[PDB]
Amino acid sequence: RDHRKIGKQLDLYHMQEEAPGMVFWHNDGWTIFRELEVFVRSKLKEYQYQEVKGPFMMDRVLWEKTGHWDNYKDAMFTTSSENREYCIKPMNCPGHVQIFNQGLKSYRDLPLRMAEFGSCHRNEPSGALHGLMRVRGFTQDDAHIFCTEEQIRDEVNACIRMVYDMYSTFGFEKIVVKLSTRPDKRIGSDEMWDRAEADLAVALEENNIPFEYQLGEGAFYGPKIEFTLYDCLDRAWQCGTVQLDFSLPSRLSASYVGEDNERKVPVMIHRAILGSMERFIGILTEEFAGFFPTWLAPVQVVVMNITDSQSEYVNELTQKLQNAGIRVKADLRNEKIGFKIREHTLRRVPYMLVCGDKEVEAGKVAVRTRRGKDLGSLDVNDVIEKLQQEIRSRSLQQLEE
Amino acid sequence: GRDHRKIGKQLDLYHMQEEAPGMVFWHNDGWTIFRELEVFVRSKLKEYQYQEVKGPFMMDRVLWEKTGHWDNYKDAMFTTSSENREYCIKPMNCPGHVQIFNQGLKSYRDLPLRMAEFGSCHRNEPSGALHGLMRVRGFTQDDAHIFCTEEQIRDEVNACIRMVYDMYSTFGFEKIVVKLSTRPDKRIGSDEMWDRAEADLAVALEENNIPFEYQLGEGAFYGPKIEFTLYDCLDRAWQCGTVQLDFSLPSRLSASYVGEDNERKVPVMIHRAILGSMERFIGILTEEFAGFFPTWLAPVQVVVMNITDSQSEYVNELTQKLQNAGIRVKADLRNEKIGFKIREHTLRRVPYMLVCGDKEVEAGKVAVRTRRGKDLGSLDVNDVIEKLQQEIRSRSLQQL
Ligand SMILES: [Zn+2]
Numbered sequence: 001r002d003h004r005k006i007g008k009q010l011d012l013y014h015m016q017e018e019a020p021g022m023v024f025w026h027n028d029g030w031t032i033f034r035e036l037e038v039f040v041r042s043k044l045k046e047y048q049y050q051e052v053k054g055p056f057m058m059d060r061v062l063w064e065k066t067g068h069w070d071n072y073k074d075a076m077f078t079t080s081s082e083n084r085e086y087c088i089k090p091m092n093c094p095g096h097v098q099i100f101n102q103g104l105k106s107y108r109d110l111p112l113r114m115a116e117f118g119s120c121h122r123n124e125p126s127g128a129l130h131g132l133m134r135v136r137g138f139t140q141d142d143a144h145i146f147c148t149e150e151q152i153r154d155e156v157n158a159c160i161r162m163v164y165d166m167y168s169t170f171g172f173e174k175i176v177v178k179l180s181t182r183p184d185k186r187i188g189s190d191e192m193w194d195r196a197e198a199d200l201a202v203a204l205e206e207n208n209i210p211f212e213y214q215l216g217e218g219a220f221y222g223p224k225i226e227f228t229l230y231d232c233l234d235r236a237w238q239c240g241t242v243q244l245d246f247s248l249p250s251r252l253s254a255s256y257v258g259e260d261n262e263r264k265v266p267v268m269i270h271r272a273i274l275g276s277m278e279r280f281i282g283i284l285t286e287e288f289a290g291f292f293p294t295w296l297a298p299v300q301v302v303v304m305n306i307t308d309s310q311s312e313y314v315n316e317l318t319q320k321l322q323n324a325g326i327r328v329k330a331d332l333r334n335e336k337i338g339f340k341i342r343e344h345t346l347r348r349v350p351y352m353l354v355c356g357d358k359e360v361e362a363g364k365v366a367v368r369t370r371r372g373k374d375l376g377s378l379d380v381n382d383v384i385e386k387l388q389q390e391i392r393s394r395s396l397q398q399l400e401e
Numbered sequence: 402g403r404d405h406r407k408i409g410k411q412l413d414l415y416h417m418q419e420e421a422p423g424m425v426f427w428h429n430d431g432w433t434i435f436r437e438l439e440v441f442v443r444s445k446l447k448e449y450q451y452q453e454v455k456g457p458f459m460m461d462r463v464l465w466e467k468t469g470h471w472d473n474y475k476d477a478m479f480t481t482s483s484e485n486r487e488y489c490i491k492p493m494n495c496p497g498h499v500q501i502f503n504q505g506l507k508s509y510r511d512l513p514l515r516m517a518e519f520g521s522c523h524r525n526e527p528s529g530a531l532h533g534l535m536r537v538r539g540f541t542q543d544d545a546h547i548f549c550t551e552e553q554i555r556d557e558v559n560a561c562i563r564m565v566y567d568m569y570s571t572f573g574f575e576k577i578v579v580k581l582s583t584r585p586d587k588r589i590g591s592d593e594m595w596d597r598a599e600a601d602l603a604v605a606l607e608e609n610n611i612p613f614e615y616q617l618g619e620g621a622f623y624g625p626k627i628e629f630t631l632y633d634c635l636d637r638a639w640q641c642g643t644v645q646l647d648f649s650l651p652s653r654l655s656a657s658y659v660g661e662d663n664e665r666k667v668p669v670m671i672h673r674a675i676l677g678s679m680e681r682f683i684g685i686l687t688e689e690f691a692g693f694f695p696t697w698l699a700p701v702q703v704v705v706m707n708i709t710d711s712q713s714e715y716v717n718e719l720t721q722k723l724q725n726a727g728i729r730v731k732a733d734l735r736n737e738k739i740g741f742k743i744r745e746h747t748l749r750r751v752p753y754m755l756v757c758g759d760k761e762v763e764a765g766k767v768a769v770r771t772r773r774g775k776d777l778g779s780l781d782v783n784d785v786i787e788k789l790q791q792e793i794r795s796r797s798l799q800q801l
């Protein structure tokens with residue numbers, strides 16, 4: 001269950017000292033990453049999110065206006081050009097306000113929900129680095145909701161729904177929740193904080209989610225909910241955040257026209273569910289011990305022959321699976337069937353499709369899993385329909401037989 | 402009237418600010434086009450047997466000195482510091498791909514190894530030289546590297562050529578001009594090495610009946626290159642494609658593989674990009690089509706609409722059916738009159754707009770019209786989804 005060990009064995013990624021804390025994603029690892037993105041994108045569509053992309057760097061002068069400069073200055077990478085200093089972004093929030101700022105916005109356009117797989121950089125010390133968990137270059141599944149004060153409650157409700165929806169896809173059911181309240185150094189009135197803390201509380205209570213208050217641990221710009229998941233070893237992983245913000249929009253001149261035809265500043269909600277996606281792949285690697293569910297598996301099916309005699313049956317079967325949209329390889333090497341099954345079991349291939357004479361003659365295929373389960377001979381088109389359904393639904397379970 | 406800057410504003414594709422010179426903020430609809438272009442490149446990566454990888458945003462200056470590009474790229478690179486060490490923000494993906502190749506023992510059976518990346522790169526060039534999307538600082542090339550033997554060079558260049566013409570034809574670019582750049586004064590390798598490398602490129606083009614002009618002395622110091630230049634509907638030249646041989650970077654970065662005789666051989670590297678900067682290519686396409694993007698590229702492909710409040714439920718069923726077929730669709734159930742709605746999506750270049758009246762609901766049909774302002778009449782629901790699916794999935798330049 002060591003993601004560094006498993007990552008090296010399965011050839012997912014590597015790290016080296018010429019680029020501390022930044023991942024070289026190999027083909028198979030990048031396949032896992034991309035499928036994770038596809039999954040998040042399907043959630044973004046279902047929950048009515050835009051997807052944008054911002055630039056990697058921005059003038060220090062703009063970062064000075066955010067309210068984050070003094071707190072982040074030591075953690076940012078900077079770079080110079082033509083007497084101007086640029087910060088490499090450690091967060092996507094200011095960039096999203098820049099996009100919001102183009103074109104006149106109305107009350108009609110709110111809530112405006114804006115997501116991004118934004119590659120951010122944080123200059124942490126080198127000794128603090130550790131595989132995929134603590135990295136310098138990271139991609140959060142971050143997003144921002146711009147809304148009215150009256151809309152906050154419904155939008156936190158949706159965020160909450162989206163969090164438990166996404167976590168239960170990977171088999172994470174034990175979730176611990178903390179609501180962090182007003183710090184000592186903060187902005188805004190006491191009744192603004194009363195309302196904001198009440199909206200987060202009521203939203204959790206409306207969904208029958210237990211939580212503990214964390215006194216004085218909120219950010220200066222608003223209160224937050226944090227979600228901590230537990231893996232199959234019962235280890236805690238803080239991942240999710242819903243963070244209200246009454247500072248950044250006004251700080252970066254964000255506005256919209258209300259029903260009463262008056263200029264109003266929108267409330268901002270920061271939300272990430274998985275958190276750092278590099279880290280989350282690390283968490284999944286250890287949760288599953290390298291046995292990634294079929295939909296995430298780099299190679300989903302390996303088709304193999306017993307002898308040279310079945311090679312063209314394997315080729316046709318392999319082409320059928322390519323056409324069905326399945327990540328498939330053909331193992332036509334001059335090796336024993338047991339040697340082929342052992343190698344791909346160790347590579348954690350979900351399904352091995354074995355083709356002997358009896359399978360060829362009947363128009364069938366013998367299905368073996370990486371767990372060692374023999375599901376017997378099955379009709380080829382029936383196996384493909386069942387493989388598709390497993391992938392389509394993102395099931396944790398392999399087929400029954 | 403085909404300025405990408407104007408169309409990009411009108412269709413809400415992107416913007417740029419002085420706070421981030423030459424670096425694009427992709428809005429929802431612009432980013433949709435970018436990602437579809439990415440989907441298209443990936444289908445070609447699969448067809449032409451490419452791996453896809455992702456490398457780090459920066460690496461140590463000490464490594465960039467060992468590549469041999471330091472003296473040439475010194476002024477063109479963004480640099481940053483951390484813990485008494487200097488890191489260069491990457492202007493290209495070539496070293497990083499070799500670092501991936503250096504992991505795990507490679508043999509002759511692994512070659513040719515083809516490694517692609519949508520690599521986010523940065524170049525520090527004067528702000529006066531920036532022009533919309535055509536010349537930017539933050540760019541994303543459809544870059545790839547092929548690691549192969551000396552004998553395999555001829556076949557991989559052939560594959561690169563095929564991939565270039567295949568991809569340009571998808572967007573309607575048929576006028577292609579080709580240049581072969583030869584040995585400069587300051588260079589690497591023996592004379593017989595350049596005799597092989599130039600001949601490899603020249604013979605590959607000659608065998609394909611591709612006429613080219615020699616561009617004498619204008620190659621890199623580490624090998625010759627082919628350059629591909631396409632022409633838009635206004636007959637403007639855009640250099641996009643490059644196929645560059647490299648007999649230097651592998652050796653200098655300790656790239657090796659176990660040959661057929663069980664001894665360490667250094668592989669040769671083919672650098673290749675087809676679209677080039679994808680921000681720039683999006684720019685070229687925006688102008689080529691004047692915002693009337695082919696349906697597969699269009700940010701919003703279909704908009705379903707009700708004549709009055711009565712049809713509300715029928716629009717939602719039709720929208721869902723379209724969404725199940727894999728079509729980027731938006732229901733428009735506002736209360737602003739029919740012509741008002743049509744006008745708005747017409748001006749945003751939505752390929753198809755589906756009006757739903759009483760005669761259409763009872764008959765089980767839909768009234769289709771185009772962004773051009775052309776009536777296709779009342780047609781069957783399921784036959785329209787079939788027609789759109791073929792148009793989208795085949796990546797047709799033509800509409801119905
Ligand atoms: Zn944020």
Ligand SMILES: [Zn+2]
Binds near residue numbers: 673
């Ligand atoms: Zn290159």
